[PDB]
Coordinates of C-alpha atoms in Angstrom, one line a residue:
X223 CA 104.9 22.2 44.2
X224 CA 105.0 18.5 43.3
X225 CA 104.3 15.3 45.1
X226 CA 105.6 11.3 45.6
X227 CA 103.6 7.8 46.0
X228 CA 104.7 4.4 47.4
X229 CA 103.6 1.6 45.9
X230 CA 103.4 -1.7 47.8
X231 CA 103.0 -4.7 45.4
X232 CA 102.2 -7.9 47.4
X233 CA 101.6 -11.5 46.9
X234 CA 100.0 -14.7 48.0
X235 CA 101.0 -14.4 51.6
X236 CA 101.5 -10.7 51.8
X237 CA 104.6 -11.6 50.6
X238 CA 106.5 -8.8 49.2
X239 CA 106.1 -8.9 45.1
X240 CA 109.9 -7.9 43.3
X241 CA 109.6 -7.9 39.5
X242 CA 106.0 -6.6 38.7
X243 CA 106.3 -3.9 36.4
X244 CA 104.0 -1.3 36.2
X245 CA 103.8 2.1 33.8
X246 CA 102.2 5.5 35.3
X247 CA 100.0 7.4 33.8
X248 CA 97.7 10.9 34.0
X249 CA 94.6 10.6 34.3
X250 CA 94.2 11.6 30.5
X251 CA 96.6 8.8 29.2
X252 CA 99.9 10.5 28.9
X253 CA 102.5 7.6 30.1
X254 CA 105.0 9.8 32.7
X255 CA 106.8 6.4 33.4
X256 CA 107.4 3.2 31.5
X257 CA 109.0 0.0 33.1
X258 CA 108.7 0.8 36.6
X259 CA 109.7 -2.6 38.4
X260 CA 109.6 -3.5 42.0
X261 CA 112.4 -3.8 44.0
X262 CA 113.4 -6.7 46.4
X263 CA 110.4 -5.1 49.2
X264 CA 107.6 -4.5 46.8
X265 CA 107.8 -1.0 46.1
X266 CA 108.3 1.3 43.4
X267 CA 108.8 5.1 44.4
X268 CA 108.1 7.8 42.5
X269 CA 109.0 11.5 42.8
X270 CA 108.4 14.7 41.0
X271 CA 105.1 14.3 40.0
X272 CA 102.8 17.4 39.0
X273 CA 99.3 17.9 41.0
X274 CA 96.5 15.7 39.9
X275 CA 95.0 12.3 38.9
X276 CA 97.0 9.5 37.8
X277 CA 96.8 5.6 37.9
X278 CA 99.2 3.1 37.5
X279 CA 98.6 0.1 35.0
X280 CA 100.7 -3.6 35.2
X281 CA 102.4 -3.9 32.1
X282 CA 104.2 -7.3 33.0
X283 CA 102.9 -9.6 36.0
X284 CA 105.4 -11.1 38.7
X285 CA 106.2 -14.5 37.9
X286 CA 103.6 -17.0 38.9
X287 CA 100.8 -14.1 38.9
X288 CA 97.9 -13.3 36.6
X289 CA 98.8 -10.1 34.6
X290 CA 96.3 -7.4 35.7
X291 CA 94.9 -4.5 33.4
X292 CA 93.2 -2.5 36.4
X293 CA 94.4 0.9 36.6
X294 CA 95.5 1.5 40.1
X295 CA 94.0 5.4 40.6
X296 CA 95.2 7.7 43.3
X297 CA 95.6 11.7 43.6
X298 CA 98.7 14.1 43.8
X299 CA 97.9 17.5 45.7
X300 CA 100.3 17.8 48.4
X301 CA 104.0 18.7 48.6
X302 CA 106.0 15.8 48.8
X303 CA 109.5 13.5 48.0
X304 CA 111.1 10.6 48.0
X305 CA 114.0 9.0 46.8
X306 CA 114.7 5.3 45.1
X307 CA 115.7 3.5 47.9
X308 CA 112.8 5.8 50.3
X309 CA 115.8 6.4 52.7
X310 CA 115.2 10.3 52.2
X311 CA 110.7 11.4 52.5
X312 CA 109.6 14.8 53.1
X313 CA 106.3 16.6 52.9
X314 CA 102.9 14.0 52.1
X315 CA 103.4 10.5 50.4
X316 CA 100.3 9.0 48.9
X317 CA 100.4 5.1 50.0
X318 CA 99.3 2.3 47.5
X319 CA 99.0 -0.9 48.0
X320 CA 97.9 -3.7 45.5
X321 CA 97.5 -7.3 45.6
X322 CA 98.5 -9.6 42.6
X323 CA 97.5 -12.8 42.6
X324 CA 98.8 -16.3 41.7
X325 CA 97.9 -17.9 38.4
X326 CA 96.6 -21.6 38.5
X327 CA 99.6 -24.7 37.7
X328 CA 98.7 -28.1 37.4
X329 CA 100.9 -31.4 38.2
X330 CA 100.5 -34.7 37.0
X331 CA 102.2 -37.9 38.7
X332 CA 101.8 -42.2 39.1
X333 CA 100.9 -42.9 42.2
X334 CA 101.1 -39.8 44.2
X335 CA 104.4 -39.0 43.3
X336 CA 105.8 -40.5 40.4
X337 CA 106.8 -40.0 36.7
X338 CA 107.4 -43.2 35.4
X339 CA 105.6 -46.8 36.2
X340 CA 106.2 -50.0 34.4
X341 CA 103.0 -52.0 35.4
X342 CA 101.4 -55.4 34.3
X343 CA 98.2 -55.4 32.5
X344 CA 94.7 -54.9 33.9
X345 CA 96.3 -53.1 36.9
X346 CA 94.7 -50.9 39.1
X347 CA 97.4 -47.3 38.9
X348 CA 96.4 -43.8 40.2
X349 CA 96.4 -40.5 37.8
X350 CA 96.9 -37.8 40.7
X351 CA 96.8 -34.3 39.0
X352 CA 96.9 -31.4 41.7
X353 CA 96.1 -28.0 40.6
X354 CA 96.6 -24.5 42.3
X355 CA 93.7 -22.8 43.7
X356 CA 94.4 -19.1 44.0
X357 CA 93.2 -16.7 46.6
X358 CA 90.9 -15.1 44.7
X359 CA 88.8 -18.4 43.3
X360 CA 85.6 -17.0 44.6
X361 CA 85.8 -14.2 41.9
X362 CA 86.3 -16.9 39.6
X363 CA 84.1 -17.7 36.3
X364 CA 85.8 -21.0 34.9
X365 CA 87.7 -23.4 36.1
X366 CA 88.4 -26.8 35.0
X367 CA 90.8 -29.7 35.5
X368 CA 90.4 -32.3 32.3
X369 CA 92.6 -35.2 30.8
X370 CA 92.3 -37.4 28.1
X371 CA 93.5 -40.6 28.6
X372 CA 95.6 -42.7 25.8
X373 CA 92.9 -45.0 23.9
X374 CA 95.2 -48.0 25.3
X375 CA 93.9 -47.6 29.2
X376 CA 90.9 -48.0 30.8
X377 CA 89.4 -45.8 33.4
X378 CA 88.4 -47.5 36.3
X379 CA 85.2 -46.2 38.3
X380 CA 84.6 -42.8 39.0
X381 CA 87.7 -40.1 39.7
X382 CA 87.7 -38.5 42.9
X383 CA 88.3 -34.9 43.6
X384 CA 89.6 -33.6 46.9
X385 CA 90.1 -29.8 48.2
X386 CA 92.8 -30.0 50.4
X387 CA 92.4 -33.4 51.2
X388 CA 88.6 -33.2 51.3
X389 CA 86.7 -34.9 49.1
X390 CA 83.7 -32.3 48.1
X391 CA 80.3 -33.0 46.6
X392 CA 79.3 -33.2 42.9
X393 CA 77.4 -29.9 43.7
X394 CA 80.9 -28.2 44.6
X395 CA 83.4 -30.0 41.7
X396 CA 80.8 -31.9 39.1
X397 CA 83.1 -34.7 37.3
X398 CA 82.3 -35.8 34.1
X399 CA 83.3 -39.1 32.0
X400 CA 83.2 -38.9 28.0
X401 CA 84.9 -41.6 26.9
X402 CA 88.7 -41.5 27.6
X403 CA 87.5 -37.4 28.9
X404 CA 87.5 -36.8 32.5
X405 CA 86.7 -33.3 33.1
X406 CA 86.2 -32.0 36.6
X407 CA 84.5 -28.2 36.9
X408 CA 83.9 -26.5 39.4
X409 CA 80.6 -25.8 40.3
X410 CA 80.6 -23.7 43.7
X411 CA 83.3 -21.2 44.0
X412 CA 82.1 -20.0 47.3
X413 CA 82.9 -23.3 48.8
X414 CA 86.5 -23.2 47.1
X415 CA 87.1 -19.9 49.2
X416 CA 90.3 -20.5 51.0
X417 CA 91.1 -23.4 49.6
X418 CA 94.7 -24.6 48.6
X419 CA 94.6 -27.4 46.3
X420 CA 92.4 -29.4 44.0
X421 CA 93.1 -33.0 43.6
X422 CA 92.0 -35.0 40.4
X423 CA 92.6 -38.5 40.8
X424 CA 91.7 -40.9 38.2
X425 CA 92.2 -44.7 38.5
X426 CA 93.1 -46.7 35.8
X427 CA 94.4 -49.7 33.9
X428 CA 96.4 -50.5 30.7
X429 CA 94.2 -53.0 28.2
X430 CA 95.7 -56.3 27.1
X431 CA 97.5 -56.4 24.0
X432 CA 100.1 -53.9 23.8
X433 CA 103.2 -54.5 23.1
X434 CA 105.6 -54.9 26.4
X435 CA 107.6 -52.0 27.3
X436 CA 105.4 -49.8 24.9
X437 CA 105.8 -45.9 27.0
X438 CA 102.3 -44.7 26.9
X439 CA 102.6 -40.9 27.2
X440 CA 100.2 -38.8 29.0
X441 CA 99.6 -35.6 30.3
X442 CA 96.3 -33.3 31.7
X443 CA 95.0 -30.0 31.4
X444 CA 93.5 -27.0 33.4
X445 CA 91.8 -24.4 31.8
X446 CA 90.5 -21.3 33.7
X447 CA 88.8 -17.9 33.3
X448 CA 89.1 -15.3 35.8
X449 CA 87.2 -11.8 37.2
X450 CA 89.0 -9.9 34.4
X451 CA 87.7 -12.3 31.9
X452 CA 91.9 -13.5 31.9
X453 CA 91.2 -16.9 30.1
X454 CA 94.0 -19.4 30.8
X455 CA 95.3 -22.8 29.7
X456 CA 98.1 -24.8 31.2
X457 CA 99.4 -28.2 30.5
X458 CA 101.0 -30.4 33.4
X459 CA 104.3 -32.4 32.4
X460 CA 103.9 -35.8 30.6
X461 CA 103.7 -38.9 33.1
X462 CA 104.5 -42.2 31.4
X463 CA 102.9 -45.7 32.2
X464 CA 105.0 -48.9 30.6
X465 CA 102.8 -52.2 29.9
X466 CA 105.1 -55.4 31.1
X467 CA 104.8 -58.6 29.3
X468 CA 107.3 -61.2 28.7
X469 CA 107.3 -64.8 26.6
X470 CA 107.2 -68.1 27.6
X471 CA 108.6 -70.5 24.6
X472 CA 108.5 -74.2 25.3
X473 CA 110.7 -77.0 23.0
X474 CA 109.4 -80.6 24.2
X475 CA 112.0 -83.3 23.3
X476 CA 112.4 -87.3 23.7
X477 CA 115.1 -87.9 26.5
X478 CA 117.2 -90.1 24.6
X479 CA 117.2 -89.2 20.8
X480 CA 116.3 -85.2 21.5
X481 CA 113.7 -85.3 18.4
X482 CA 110.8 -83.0 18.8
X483 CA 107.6 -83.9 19.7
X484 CA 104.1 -82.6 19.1
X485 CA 100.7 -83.1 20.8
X486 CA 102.5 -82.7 23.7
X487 CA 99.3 -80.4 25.9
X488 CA 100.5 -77.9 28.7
X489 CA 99.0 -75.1 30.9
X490 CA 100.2 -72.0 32.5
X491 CA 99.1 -71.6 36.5
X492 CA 99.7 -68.7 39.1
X493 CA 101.5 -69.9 42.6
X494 CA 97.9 -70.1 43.7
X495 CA 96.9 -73.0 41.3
X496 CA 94.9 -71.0 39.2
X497 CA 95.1 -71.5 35.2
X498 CA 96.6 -68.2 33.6
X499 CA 93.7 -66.1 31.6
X500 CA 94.9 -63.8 28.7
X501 CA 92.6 -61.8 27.2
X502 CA 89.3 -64.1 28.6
X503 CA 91.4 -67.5 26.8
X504 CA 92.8 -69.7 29.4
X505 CA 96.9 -70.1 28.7
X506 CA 97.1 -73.7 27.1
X507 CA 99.1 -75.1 24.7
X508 CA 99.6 -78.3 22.1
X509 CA 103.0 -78.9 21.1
X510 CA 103.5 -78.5 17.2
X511 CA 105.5 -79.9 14.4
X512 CA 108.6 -78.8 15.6
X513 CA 107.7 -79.8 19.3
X514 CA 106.9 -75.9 20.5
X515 CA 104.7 -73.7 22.7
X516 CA 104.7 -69.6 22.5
X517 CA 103.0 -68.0 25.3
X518 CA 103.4 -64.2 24.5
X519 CA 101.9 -61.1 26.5
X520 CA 102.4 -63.2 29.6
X521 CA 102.4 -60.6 32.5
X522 CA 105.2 -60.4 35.0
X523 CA 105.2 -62.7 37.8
X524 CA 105.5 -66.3 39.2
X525 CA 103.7 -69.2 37.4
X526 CA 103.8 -73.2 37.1
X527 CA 103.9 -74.9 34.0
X528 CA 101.6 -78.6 34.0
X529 CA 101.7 -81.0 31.7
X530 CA 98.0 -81.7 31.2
X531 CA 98.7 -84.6 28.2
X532 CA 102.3 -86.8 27.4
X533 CA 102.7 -87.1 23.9
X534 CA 103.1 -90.4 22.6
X535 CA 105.6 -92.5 21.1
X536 CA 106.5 -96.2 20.1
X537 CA 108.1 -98.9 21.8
X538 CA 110.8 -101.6 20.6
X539 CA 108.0 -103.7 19.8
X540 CA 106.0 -101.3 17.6
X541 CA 103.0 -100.0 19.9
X542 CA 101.9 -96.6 20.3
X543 CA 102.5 -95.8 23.8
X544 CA 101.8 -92.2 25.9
X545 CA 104.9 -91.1 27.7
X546 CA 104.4 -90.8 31.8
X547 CA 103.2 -87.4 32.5
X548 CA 106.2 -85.2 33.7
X549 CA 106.7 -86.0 37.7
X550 CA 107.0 -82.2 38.6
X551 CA 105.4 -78.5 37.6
X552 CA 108.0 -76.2 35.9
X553 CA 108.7 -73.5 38.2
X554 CA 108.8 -70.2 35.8
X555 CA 109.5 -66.3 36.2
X556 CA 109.1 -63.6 34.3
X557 CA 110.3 -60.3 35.1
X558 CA 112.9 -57.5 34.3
X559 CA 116.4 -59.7 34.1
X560 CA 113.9 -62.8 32.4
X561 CA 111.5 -61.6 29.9
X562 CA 111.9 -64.6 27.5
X563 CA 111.6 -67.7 29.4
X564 CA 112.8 -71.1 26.8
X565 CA 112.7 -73.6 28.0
X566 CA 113.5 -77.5 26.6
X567 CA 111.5 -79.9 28.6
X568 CA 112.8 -83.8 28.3
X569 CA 110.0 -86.7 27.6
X570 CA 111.1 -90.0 29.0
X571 CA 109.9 -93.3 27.3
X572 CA 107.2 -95.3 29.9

């Protein structure tokens, strides 16, 4: 006189679990199986069992899925079998089911969907970090999305959180700015009931200053606490955001004897006609000694170089005279293939 039980693990669709392992036990604590896994349908069989109470316990989660310490109780007091496969049942076979579900991930990308962005200073760039929101969120006690930003950006206005493409109120996901700290925590769990995703995106710019082609690292966290009081903490992969500056070296010179010249005044401009600021300092230069201007942290781009004063010079006759002023702006890009711009600009004698 013995008796069998089926036990169907499932997942986040219903789908079939295959890999949770789960130990049985008496009611009393005596382990009659240890690393019981399920198969490729979800179940594990088990036959042979004397009359009474038993329970099974999860000893090691399916992957993706919070481990679960509930003891899964049922009763053995009628005759029945059934093999591994469940091909061959007689008599009564106590059915179990059990629901595991999925622990929280996070992703971090640039711009919805990259890893990597080389970007100019003082430019707008998007942080998007998506997070998993599992079926059983209502039950929920904690859950937050945070990230610290590198002290070399700036975050711009307030992030945004949307649940599955909604953006929700501050009485549903509260988000919080301490400094570089964003934190986002959830607030109403009711309302994140059948919800899918959770969508932290925070805007933001890289200061002026930093050295071009500098890889500023970054990455965000989640941390969550479920019913079973199962804290968690998981950390996205790192996205990395790459400042882009180049340099803009002038070397003004007499047409004829190619001897350097100082005083020589220029400005930087954008195709627009507007003088170049770098950090609140319009882009102007005086010629030195050795007749040169060094424009660094220069973002990438189109600009025209002026001459804004000739530097001046001495005629056969002895008599301090100002050259003519260059007849044409210095057309000048800096990018990936030209990140140091010289350039020797030719005075001529008038």
């Amino acid at each position: 006189k013995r008796g069998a039980v089926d036990l169907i693990k499932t997942g986040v669709n219903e789908k079939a679990m295959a890999g949770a392992v789960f130990s049985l036990f008496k009611k009393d604590g005596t382990e009659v199986k240890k690393e019981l896994a399920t198969d490729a349908n979800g179940h594990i069989r088990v036959q042979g069992l004397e009359y009474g109470e038993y329970y099974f316990q999860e000893t090691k989660a399916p992957k993706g899925y919070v481990i679960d310490p509930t003891k899964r109780e049922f009763f053995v007091k009628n005759s029945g079998t059934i093999n591994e496969d469940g091909t061959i049942t007689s008599g009564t076979v106590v059915k179990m089911e059990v629901k595991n579900n999925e622990e929280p991930t996070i992703d971090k990308k640039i711009n919805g969907k990259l890893e990597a962005l080389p970007i100019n200073p003082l430019t707008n760039y998007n942080y998007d970090i998506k997070t998993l929101i599992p079926e059983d969120i209502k039950e929920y006690k904690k859950y937050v999305v945070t990230a610290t930003l590198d002290n070399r950006l700036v975050i711009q206005g307030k992030p945004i959180v949307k649940i599955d493409g909604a953006e929700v109120n501050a009485n549903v996901v509260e988000v919080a700015i301490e400094g570089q700290k964003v934190t986002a925590t959830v607030k109403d769990f009711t309302k994140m009931d059948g919800k899918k995703e959770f969508h932290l995106q925070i805007k933001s710019q890289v200061k002026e200053g930093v050295p071009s082609g500098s890889e500023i690292l970054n990455t965000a966290k989640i941390h969550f606490t479920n019913k079973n009081d199962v804290i968690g903490e998981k950390e996205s992969k790192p996205v990395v955001v790459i400042p882009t500056t180049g340099i803009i070296e002038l070397t003004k010179i007499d047409s004829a004897n190619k001897n350097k010249m100082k005083g020589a005044e220029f400005v930087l401009k954008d195709n627009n006609g507007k003088i170049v600021v770098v950090a609140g300092k319009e882009v102007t230069g005086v010629s030195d000694e050795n007749g040169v201007i060094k424009w660094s942290n220069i973002p990438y781009g189109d600009y025209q170089i002026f001459e804004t004063k000739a530097p001046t010079y001495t005629k056969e006759d002895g008599t301090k005279t100002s050259y003519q002023l260059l007849k044409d702006p210095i057309d000048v890009k800096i990018s990936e293939n030209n990140q140091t711009v010289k350039l020797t600009i030719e005075n001529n004698k008038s």
